[PDB]
Amino acid sequence: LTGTGVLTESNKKFLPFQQFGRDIADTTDAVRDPQTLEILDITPCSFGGV
Amino acid sequence: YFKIYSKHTPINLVRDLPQGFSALEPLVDLPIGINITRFQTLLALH
Numbered sequence: 702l703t704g705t706g707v708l709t710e711s712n713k714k715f716l717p718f719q720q721f722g723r724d725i726a727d728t729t730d731a732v733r734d735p736q737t738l739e740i741l742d743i744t745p746c747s748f749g750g751v
Numbered sequence: 752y753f754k755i756y757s758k759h760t761p762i763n764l765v766r767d768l769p770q771g772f773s774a775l776e777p778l779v780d781l782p783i784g785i786n787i788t789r790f791q792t793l794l795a796l797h
């Protein structure tokens with residue numbers, strides 16, 4: 702699962718059966734890490750017009 | 752895929768099934784590929 706974004710701590714209690722979450726759009730909002738099993742929040746990197 | 756969902760909840764109505772809502776989450780998923788057509792439960796003989 703690839704993407705770009707800021708990974709921060711989160712307080713969304715994933716239940717034991719879900720591994721990754723998706724937006725209203727078909728893209729990841731947060732993910733569970735392998736090896737250490739933790740929940741990383743994904744917030745899109747800043748962008749904008751010039 | 753044989754998907755198993757389950758939930759334990761208190762109940763207080765023996766005439767029918769108590770009113771309310773609860774969704775059951777998956778626990779086990781076995782890729783057996785067996786044509787399953789019937790099932791039965793097992794009770795402890797006493």
Ligand SMILES: *[C@@H]1O[C@H](CO)[C@@H](O)[C@H](O)[C@H]1NC(C)=O
Nearest residue numbers: 720733734735736737738739
């Ligand atoms: C990967 O390594 C970490 C480091 O201790 C360990 O806790 C974890 O259990 C390992 N992964 C699995 C799937 O066991």
